[PDB]
Design a protein around this nucleic acid. Structure first.
Length: 667
RNA sequence: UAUCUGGUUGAUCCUGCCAGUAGUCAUAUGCUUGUCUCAAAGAUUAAGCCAUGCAUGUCUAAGUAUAAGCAAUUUAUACAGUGAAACUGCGAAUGGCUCAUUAAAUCAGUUAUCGUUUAUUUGAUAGUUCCUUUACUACAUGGUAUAACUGUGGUAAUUCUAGAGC
RNA sequence: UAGUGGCCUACCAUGGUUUCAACGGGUAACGGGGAAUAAGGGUUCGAUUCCGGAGAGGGAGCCUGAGAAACGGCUACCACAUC
RNA sequence: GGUCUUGUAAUUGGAAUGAGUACAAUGUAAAUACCUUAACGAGGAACAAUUGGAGGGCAAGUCUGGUGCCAGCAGCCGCGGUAAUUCCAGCUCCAAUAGCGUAUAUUAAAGUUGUUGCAGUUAAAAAGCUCGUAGUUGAACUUUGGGCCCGGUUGGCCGGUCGGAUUUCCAACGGGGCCUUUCCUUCUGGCUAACCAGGACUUUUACUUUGAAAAAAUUAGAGUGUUCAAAGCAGGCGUAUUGCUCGAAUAUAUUAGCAUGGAAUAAUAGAAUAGGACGUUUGGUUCUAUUUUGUUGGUUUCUAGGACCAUCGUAAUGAUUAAUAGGGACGGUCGGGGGCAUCAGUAUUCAAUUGUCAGAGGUGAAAUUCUUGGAUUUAUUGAAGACUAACUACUGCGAAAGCAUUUGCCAAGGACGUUUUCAUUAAUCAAGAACGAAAGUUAGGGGAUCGAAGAUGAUCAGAUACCGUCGUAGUCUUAACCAUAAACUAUGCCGACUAGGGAUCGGGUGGUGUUUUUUUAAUGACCCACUCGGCACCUUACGAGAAAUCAAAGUCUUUGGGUUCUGGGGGGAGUAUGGUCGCAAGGCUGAAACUUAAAGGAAUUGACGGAAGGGCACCACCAGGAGUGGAGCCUGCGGCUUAAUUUGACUCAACACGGGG
RNA sequence: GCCCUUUGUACACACCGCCCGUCGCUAGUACCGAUUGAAUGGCUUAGUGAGGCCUCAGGAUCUGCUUAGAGAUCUCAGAGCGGAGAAUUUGGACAAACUUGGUCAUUUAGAGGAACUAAAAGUCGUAACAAGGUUUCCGUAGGUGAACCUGCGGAAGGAUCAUUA
């Protein structure tokens, strides 16, 4: 009735809205504050091979003076549940050795608090230290609270000595600047400021890290529950986004498996409504029957340019014999018409990095020697008009389709199923994270080489989803790694991480421009600056991580050869390709209307039958071939202006190659 | 130091808005950052919530010493120089912070108290006190009550305190 | 009451304020010198080192005392919240 | 010939230094630093100043590459479609400089808040017109001119001081003592009015002038070498011989409050009864004790100090005006002014009689109706309404809406004349109240006229749907509303003046003034003059306005005669919402959310026409000739076919084939 | 047909229905909210009202003076009276607060409606089909696919050369 929203001195009654803000500051104090399933992973990895965190646990905590001193033990615990008697919390500090580079980047999904070890003794190395900066950094640092752990650096000068601290406080801020000062080991309350940082200072969050169900791997077992399965008694402080009884369990480096009964020490089984233990979709073989494009390659008259162009020129072959002797180009048809390895990194490094321009400028040029044939090589695919305007498709019916392309979970869209896939975990989230859990995880006897008991070593365990058991086809966004100048050809197996886990996938990089129509290329090779878009089949981990593509070798002081970082863009079937061609025209003279071009067509059936190709200049002057006669190849057309011997009278082969699957590398 | 400029029309003669510009003991903030003297600095936005430590206690010739406490006894058997604790007195109503309230309220300038209280400070001020000073008197000075001292204890824990003897 | 007084209280009178704006409402309102100004006037701000007022999270209430409706004083309620 | 320089000069040339490290001690409660201080650390690679721009506002290239709508660039406009000054870069340059940007907020320019100091004819804005209260203002009058001197200040011929007035001649700026009715008072001890007590003022508020209160800190400024400063109120000087000694101003802060003149302005009015002042007067009323009485209290007077009746002696005994401001009376006019009856008109259509004997009706073509039981052009009598047609305008009036023929009736008004009466009774206007076109709203009268809607005929495509015919209500009135107009002269109402005019109409006057005839200028009307009322016009525009135009849309930047209501860019929007007034329809008051670089005013210059004139052309037309138009081929191409069956623009095209048979 | 051109006089580009509109979908947000949860309160209706302070009282107790029970400054019942005086209870007024009614609400959580918004995409009508109005108003009354039209009043914000004694 009355629009009477005035008299708002009881706008102060709407400090009720601050009460919601009070409610905003209550339910987030549920999972992180206590002892019963509230102890946090803090992994201390210095940037320096010295500083050796047995004194960082001890000589730093000589100001705390509770008995984390007493268990600061040569029997390296790594589950340090010392209840420190002033801020009331059990703890966990992972102290890894400096070399085991395989889980430091992998255990960091539960690991909230990350602490660099900063030293002016060793210069932070451009392959060890600065690249551990780039490795811990570009996975997404959950919380970076820097500590100068230097005991032997407080007397390297006596004459305003504080440059040993300023050079490190700025070095925390040259890449990851969210600390102001970095603390000396000579003030008192800075050691229980660590426990303030654990208890009262809540950590901040990574986008991709906190989207799933992720668990802790304290201990495992060797059980016999099948001819080839067992069980796992895992102590795990779960911090996931909300588990479900429908979910599956994930042993990284080995496989994808299933439980027996989810319990607490309330029984939740591995119930019937599940995807049975496939990897490619089992309905995919039957999905190799949606004959969307039966584009038979040699049983046509016209390419798919119907959709305003050609009336088709029919060549109805009705040959008649040529009886008398001696024949030129002309007289045959009017004879008797009864009309009724480091060396090849210098040998083949000449070409296998400089053939990267064979992709760019002459992609599918039919190249022309008098021995090379024009018909056979680039034969068996369409030739539409323009990549920003044409029409290429998803699922033809050919043998060119690989194994987990025609046996796919054909991913609909990524963006229109990320709401499904994530909201399968948003809504169907039943088993409560935050607690402790004793689960009978069925554990196969096959994969019992490298599953260990980490009180001193490094391993972790992850979770799965319902339809993450199925797999799909991905299309990455990649940038070149910084200060990594040398290119790599892009039809080659690169070990893809999108996140942390490793797969030697065989991608297809294409240009990462702003694409209106979402139509791509089969670009063979790379570009040294801009964004690349990979295209491959991967067995899919659907949470948009900063992707790391590398070479599987312990080459540098890093145990990786970092090739390039980028973005897990999507997993999409209709994100489709079209490889270009640019043919050649070299104008032999300087004409007015009809330009006599040579160096264009050698053979007569390569002259005559290849007169159905659209003539376009490199300047873009499109058009069609009306005639041609050249042998050592002319034409006769009509363009905007005139032509010159440095022009390119190009022609169109717009062809479509087909993608390549992955390889799971773990070693 | 009483400056204005660009935008409607094809244009001689021609109105009202917008944008630019300059200050800010206005804030915030980007980039850069070497000296000298300075120097604000948790108001808004939460008159919202707090670990921890500190911020108010105090004694001189001149209120109460048997510390068993000590220094030298050296000037003394009544005491006498120092002096813990404790009684007593004064202080703790000043300072410091914050600005939510509050619109004839506060406050500001001017009034008034012939209508009122005032530790302190400063100045002045009790022959009549046995109310019979015709006395049951001790004014050569009359009584209790107690802390600390002590020595037996309980409390999960508080600057909790109990029982007796001084 | 320290004291004037509708400050109450007991009987009386029917008054008092106002379009010279009563009363009611809002204030991102603590009031006074300051600031940005700069032909002059006008404009907007003033939590803030000084003066005065108010409060010790919000309302009550009382002791000691010359002085407090005191909170690094006390009792109770209300909102919190420690071992 | 280079004494001197502008830079090219990277060839120089040694000397020279701080930020930074340091003994040293000061420095400080203890330390840092900072004035101090020896040792050590510079050459351009040194020990290197960044930040924003580079199309206009807005300095600074149309330099060169990649870029040619592809991004770009844009606070507002403006470019790039390929000659980009405006794109990515390379240069290079421009500013401010350990400092430059950016975001919002305010101030300024911003006469876009206007008291100073806007704007309403058309650009947003004057309302429908009167009556009216609060408020805001409000007509004119009250002691001039001159003498006696005092000389505070200046002119300088004086110069006697040689930057200055002291003997001082000529005039000039000031207030006082006093005076030409200029009362400037009375009241007397100090007293013989200089000034101090004493009784009244030639009235009280509004106004203003000088004090006082206005905390210190801020704002303005001596002085001070804190090294200048920002600061700070500090400090300076010798024989340092044992000390000497300057300071730490003032300016400011209205109302309100408290003291005194000033003598206008506005206010308030005396003395219209003269029951009043000058009453220095007299019986009588309230009186009376500082008293003297005799020391102190019941009983008294004369008596110091006020008032009036009986009562009259006193000087000059009280009526500021009749307004080119209003209100009355009375007078002749005036009168399509308004109102109440009567009343006439050309006739109108409707109704009848009567006369009649086969078409009219519209529109651009057409389509809708009456009648041999009588059409329509004839002849005669009524109901209703309308308006008084022409005379009807350089009109006359009325608050506005409005009103045009007579006669009687009813007041007022307007004008004009007056040597009549009120003597400021006054202007507008919050609130409040009358009236109110057309239309519309309830209850009635007629029901003649046409006629929003509607019922019919239309009638062909949208030459365009303008046509035509009947029509409830309505138009006309009665008892009442409504409260709307381009209700507009697009201009609120009372003031001031100016132009310049020939007429008007309402009044007033009569020329040795001209004619019918009261008898040269009578009834009436005139030429020449003159006055105030209403309606108008056009000039040069002095003044404006931006401009059309305006004698007021003036006397406004040379800004203020009084008062009332509106407007702040366009929209959104007179929309929502709420408060009202009505039975209603609607009327009165009135936003935001959002979006914009515009909306708007008057004014002008000449392309294109679906405007065509004349020419004048037989490279076009009529009279026909030659003759195509049906065909074989030279001569010349577009089409098939090619290793080859080549090729293109000028009078510019359907052509020359480019001497190419 | 074009020259001398005249002249409507820019159309200074004279105004309007009039052309990316329907069905079935993609998402984004206006809004209301027929509905219960709040969330705490303005206002006030009602029954309770902690608490200290003052009073009507009460009197654990310890005491003392004096007459006191017993020995030359003696307690073994005291007895009046006096002093201080810790519980409980009367009343008072001050009174934070509970138990409540409607109401105004807000920020809100479901709950359901009509919608609009984008280059929005298959769609046949006005994409993909062609013309027509070409006095402008104001008040007011009516019809309206539309500027327009009609009724009564009004206006110019509209284009007057000539004959006159």
């Amino acid at each position: 009735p009355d629009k009477q929203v005035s008299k708002l001195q009881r706008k102060n009654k709407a400090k009720q809205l601050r009460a919601q803000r009070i409610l905003d500051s209550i339910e987030n104090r549920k999972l992180f504050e206590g002892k019963n399933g509230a102890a946090k992973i803090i992994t201390i990895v210095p940037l320096v091979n010295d500083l050796d965190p047995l004194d960082i646990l001890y000589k730093l905590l000589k100001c705390a003076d509770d008995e984390g001193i007493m268990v600061q033990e040569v029997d390296s615990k790594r589950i340090f549940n010392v209840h420190i008697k002033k801020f009331k919390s059990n703890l966990k500090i992972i102290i890894p050795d400096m070399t085991n580079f395989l889980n430091i980047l992998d255990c960091a999904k539960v690991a909230d608090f990350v602490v660099f070890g900063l030293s002016g003794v060793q210069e932070v190395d451009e392959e060890f230290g600065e690249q551990i900066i780039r490795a811990l950094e570009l996975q997404g640092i959950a919380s970076y609270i820097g500590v100068i752990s230097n005991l032997s650096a407080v007397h390297e000068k006596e004459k305003f000595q504080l440059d040993v601290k300023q050079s490190l406080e700025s070095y925390f801020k040259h890449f990851f600047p969210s600390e102001e000062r970095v603390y000396n080991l000579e003030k008192n309350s800075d050691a229980l400021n660590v426990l303030r940082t654990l208890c009262q200072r809540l950590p901040r969050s990574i986008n991709w890290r906190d989207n799933r169900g992720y668990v802790v791997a304290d201990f495992v077992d060797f059980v016999e529950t099948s001819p080839d399965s067992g069980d796992l008694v895992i102590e795990g402080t779960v911090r996931g986004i909300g588990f479900n009884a429908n979910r599956l369990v994930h042993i990284p480096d080995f496989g994808d498996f299933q439980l027996n009964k989810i319990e607490k020490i309330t029984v939740f089984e591995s119930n019937m409504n599940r995807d049975t233990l496939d990897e490619y979709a089992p309905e995919g073989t039957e999905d190799w029957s949606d004959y969307d494009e039966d584009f038979e390659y040699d049983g046509l008259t016209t390419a798919r340019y119907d959709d305003h162009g050609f009336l088709p020129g029919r060549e109805q072959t009705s040959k008649k014999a040529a009886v008398p002797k001696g024949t030129s180009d002309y007289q045959a048809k009017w004879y008797l018409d009864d009309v009724i390895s480091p060396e090849e990194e210098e040998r083949q490094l000449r070409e296998f990095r400089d053939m990267e321009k064979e992709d760019r400028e002459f992609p599918d040029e039919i190249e022309l020697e008098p021995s090379e044939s024009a018909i056979e090589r680039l034969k068996r695919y369409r030739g539409l008009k323009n990549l920003y305007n044409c029409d290429w498709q998803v699922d033809e019916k050919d043998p060119s389709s690989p194994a987990e392309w025609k046996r796919l979970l054909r991913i609909g869209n990524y963006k229109n199923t990320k709401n499904r896939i994530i909201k399968e975990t948003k809504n169907e989230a039943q088993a409560i994270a935050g607690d402790r859990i004793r689960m009978f995880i069925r554990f196969p006897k096959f994969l019992l080489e490298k599953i260990q008991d980490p009180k001193q070593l490094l391993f972790a365990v992850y979770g799965l989803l319902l339809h993450e058991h199925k797999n799909a086809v991905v299309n990455f966004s990649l940038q070149r790694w910084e200060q990594y100048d040398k290119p790599v050809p892009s039809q080659e197996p690169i070990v893809v991480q999108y996140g942390v886990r490793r797969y030697t996938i065989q991608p297809l990089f294409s240009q990462g421009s702003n694409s209106p129509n979402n139509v791509h290329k089969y670009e063979r090779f790379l570009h040294p600056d801009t964004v690349s878009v990979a295209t491959c089949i991967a067995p899919v981990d659907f949470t948009q991580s900063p992707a790391i593509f590398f070479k599987p070798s312990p080459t540098d002081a890093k145990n990786i050869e970092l090739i390039g970082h980028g973005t897990f863009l999507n997993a999409d079937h209709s994100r489709i390709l079209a490889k270009r061609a640019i043919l050649t025209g070299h104008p032999f003279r300087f004409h007015k209307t009809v330009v006599t071009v040579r160096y264009m067509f050698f053979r007569p059936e390569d002259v005559e039958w290849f007169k159905s190709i659209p003539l376009f200049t490199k300047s873009g002057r499109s058009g069609f071939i009306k005639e041609s006669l050249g042998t050592h190849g002319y034409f006769k057309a009509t363009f905007d202006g005139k032509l010159s011997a440095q022009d390119v009278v190009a022609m169109s082969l717009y062809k479509r190659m087909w993608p390549m699957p992955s390889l799971p590398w773990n070693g």
